[PDB]
Amino acid sequence: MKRTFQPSVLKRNRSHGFRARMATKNGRQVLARRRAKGRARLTVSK
Amino acid sequence: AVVKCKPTSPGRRHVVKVVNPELHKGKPFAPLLEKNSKSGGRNNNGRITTRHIGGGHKQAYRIVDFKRNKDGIPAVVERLEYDPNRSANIALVLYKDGERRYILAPKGLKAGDQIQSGVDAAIKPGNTLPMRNIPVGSTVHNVEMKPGKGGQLARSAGTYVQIVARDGAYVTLRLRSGEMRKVEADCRATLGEVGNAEHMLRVLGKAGAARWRGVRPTVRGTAMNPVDHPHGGGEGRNFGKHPVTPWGVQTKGKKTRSNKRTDKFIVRRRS
Amino acid sequence: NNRPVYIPRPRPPHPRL
RNA sequence: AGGACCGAACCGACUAAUGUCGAAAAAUUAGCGGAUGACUUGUGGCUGGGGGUGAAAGGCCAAUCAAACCGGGAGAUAGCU
RNA sequence: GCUCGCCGGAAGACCAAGGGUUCCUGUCCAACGUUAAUCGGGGCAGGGUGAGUCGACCCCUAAGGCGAGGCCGAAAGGCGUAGUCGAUGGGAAACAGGUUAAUAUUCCUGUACUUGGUGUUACUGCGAAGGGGGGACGGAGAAGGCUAUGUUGGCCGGGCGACGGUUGUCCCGGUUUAAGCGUGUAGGCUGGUUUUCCAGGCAAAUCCGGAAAAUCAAGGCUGAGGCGUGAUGACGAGGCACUACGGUGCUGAAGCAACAAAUGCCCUGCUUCCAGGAAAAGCCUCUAAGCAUCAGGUAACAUCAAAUCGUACCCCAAACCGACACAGGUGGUCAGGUAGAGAAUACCAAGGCGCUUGAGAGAACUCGGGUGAAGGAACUAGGCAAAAUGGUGCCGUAACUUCGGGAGAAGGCACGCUGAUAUGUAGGUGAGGUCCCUCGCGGAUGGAGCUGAAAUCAGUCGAAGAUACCAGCUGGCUGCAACUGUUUAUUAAAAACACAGCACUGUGCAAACACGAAAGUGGACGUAUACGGUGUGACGCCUGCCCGGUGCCGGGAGGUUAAU
RNA sequence: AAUUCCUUGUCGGGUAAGUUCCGACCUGCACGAAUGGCGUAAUGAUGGCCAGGCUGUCUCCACCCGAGACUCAGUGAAAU
């Protein structure tokens, strides 16, 4: 049984990392919404 | 040459090979190579624009000289090579000055032959002449439609066109499709017909032969569902509909030629 | 004290038809 | 030579039994199919929801697919319980 | 601690990915562990990760991403040039031994190597985003030469033994050593050298390419292993002296030969086949601009620098993905002995484990197995499941057929051990000696030694000799599909889908067509022996009649007919 | 007939006994020639039938070896 989640640090960062989010405006809006909600972990990162 | 293999096993039973002994058994000319990454039918948007394309063996692109701009420079034919990109074989040509180029190999071309380009050239097969100099009623290949373009007509294996008429500054060409096209005189053409005329005799033999040739399986519209194809649906192989393309355009006898720009160069249509 | 999150699909019933 | 033969790794999942508040939200045990090829696999990319992909089953698209998921219109509407 | 049992192409040993202290020591047992617990991957504290050479970083690039200008788009934004990113690839350099409770190819000892900066000395024309070469490449197959490694003999050390025999052809253990440097071998590739000329290499060129002659038949390149050095060093059984009794310190003999042999190396090789098998940089070489009492380059010596980050531990699992200390999933490397064709299977070595509830009893019943009188499918929707067949050699082998097949058809016979042929043959390998030598890692002769089938005859044991494990059930008639293949992840693997082939139809290339409000891409760096769509589905014999209807193609008298 | 309502069509083969199977006839409810027709060697974890061998499938079960069930100690659920 190969479950759906197969961790990979490189792919995780390149898909949901800070730089990936800021590249496009919608990701920028996502960061804005996270900041407004005041989440401790703004994004995924080491 | 055409050789039929013995029915040793299924998949090899129906194979019909086309062995060409005079082909070059060695690596090609590296300076003239160029990488050719496959696309799989996808376009810049990443969507499949053309279906049934994908996979296949890796193949490197050979820079083939179609313009043939080296006028007045006799060149010798070093050898013939297999080009995976074309249906016809290509010939490695060495010019008197000492540069090597690739050209389409006509039927009569072989190693050690002499070819030349430009008006100051003979009428031997393989020479490149403008149609104005080429006598009417002769066979040519790799014909241009605009001067300097390079040549687009009659490029496949065993293909050629006829010089049927010469109307002053324009020439009429009868193509292998039965199409009579008016072409500007000054643009160039190559004498003779493309070699490797026995390309039909091959049959590929088995399913996988088409697979590593870059072709993917084709799915009939009937086997599809109603939603994905205009055909499909019903219990027991029901069609009851006029044949159509997957996008609704009615196929099987519906002309799709609508240009109104090049029609002035069309004398007669296919028949 | 989390209430059960994943409830499995019910076992298919016997066909009373 | 071979989409050749027998057969491990590897990939697959035809039969039976067990297991159904199971060891496991499809597995184990004993057999079974392919096993130089249309093969299999690692890494990284591309295709985004009236769309993708599909050797075509309405199959698959994060345990969900005859139209994914999340938030909003939204306290939708419910002559019904 | 002594026994028993299990794994041993793994349930062992090393990595990447992913975890993130789970590592080691002291201490604690409430909670956690499906029981107890002094124990632990649990709690608390301390300790632990050492690099010019390993990896990352770094230089270059693939798919692809982003994208100055630009093109396009109501806005957002889309596409893309120059560029710049992107390892799953290419590019400089280290091995052996020892040491810690826990790190080492990082620390220590020994012996090496690479890339740059600076200085000195002796020579010299240097000089690029520019040219050329190189880097640089597929599948399959075969043989030869080797090594890792193993076996045996010799050698060295120890033992002769609690139940008979065992100083002997006896038994047990050891018989290990690298990178680098030197020599350069089997093998593989290519004929060398000199001179002249040339609109090609978008400029130039002493380089590449091409054309000419003169002269020699040879050089050059690549290249595992072996042999030397490294090394009268290290390691080394064993013995000795003290033990906080875990271990510490001291000493240290032999360290060779033969045979077998890889899936590893020579080999990015070679021979073949069609499906024709990345790119760029480092590197080598030639020049432009410019500089030539310079700078710069080459060779030698000296000196300095090589930063920064990862380094513990798990890594087929109790530490990763599955909510669990879950019978599942997870890529790569090493991979021994006996039997065997084998990485199957059986039993074992090194090594690691007995799977975190036990003790009794020995009912029905359920589960996983063994055996069975006589019958042998009478069971049942159905030979489902079980049972049986099962290997090697030889003999033999039907209908049918596309002449390949069918076929391992079917059906028969022989298989152990010992001796002899032959104090182990044929075969393989091959020392010393002897004869040559374009003189060495050479060639002949020669057979010592070692290894080692198959077959025949004879004898002999058992109920059974392919003795266990492993290891086809077979035949006849017929439906469907030609076949290999693919599919409903998780009740349907099929007659369904695909398929080679065939036919129709569209398309003249700014192609049809598709994705896109568009630009622009795919088709295709293809162009009718090509491409798209549709139907049929190898092959053999064929594929009849009908154009009313609905489509499609062509024509045009007349009628009808929008905007204007 | 993968097609056939009527229907287990009729005759023969196979069985002591055959609504299936194989061959032939044709009253083809409602086969049919590229939504292809008829054949077809080889192939198939394909559908149906027959024979040999084989056996606990069965007549009819019996016994035995293990893991549960049962008793004792510890921990200690669920649906309703």
Author numbering:
A (entry chain 2): 1 to 46
B (entry chain C): 1 to 271
C (entry chain z): 2 to 18
Article, verbatim:
Closer inspection of the 50S•Api137 cryo-EM map revealed a highly defined density for Api137 in the PET. An atomic model of Api137 taken from PDB-5O2R11 was easily fitted to this density with slight adjustments, confirming that it represents the Api137 peptide. The N-terminal and central regions were located within the PET and extended to the constriction site formed by the ribosomal proteins uL4 and uL22, while the C-terminal region was located towards the PTC. The negatively charged carboxylate close to the PTC could repel Api137 from further protrusion. Due to its stable positioning, the C-terminal carboxyl group of Api137 is able to interact with the RFs and arrest them during termination. Careful inspection of the 50S•Api137 and 50S•Api88 cryo-EM maps revealed an additional density corresponding to another apidaecin molecule in an unexpected location near the exit of the PET. The density was defined in the 50S•Api137 complex and allowed modeling of the peptide chain from Asn2 to Leu18. The N-terminal region was located at the exit pore close to the ribosomal proteins uL29 and uL23, reasoning the observed cross-links of Api88. The binding of Api137 was mediated by multiple hydrogen bonds and stacking interactions. The C-terminal carboxylate forms a hydrogen bond with the ribose oxygen of A1319.
Proline-rich antimicrobial peptides (PrAMPs) inhibit bacterial protein biosynthesis by binding to the polypeptide exit tunnel (PET) near the peptidyl transferase center. Api137 and Api88 differ only in their C-termini, i.e., a free acid versus an amide, which are negatively charged or neutral, respectively, at physiological conditions. To further interrogate the molecular mechanism of Api88, we incubated purified 50S subunits with Api137 or Api88 and subjected the samples to cryo-EM analysis. In addition, high-resolution cryo-EM reconstructions of purified 50S subunits incubated with Api137 or Api88 confirmed multiple binding sites for both peptides.
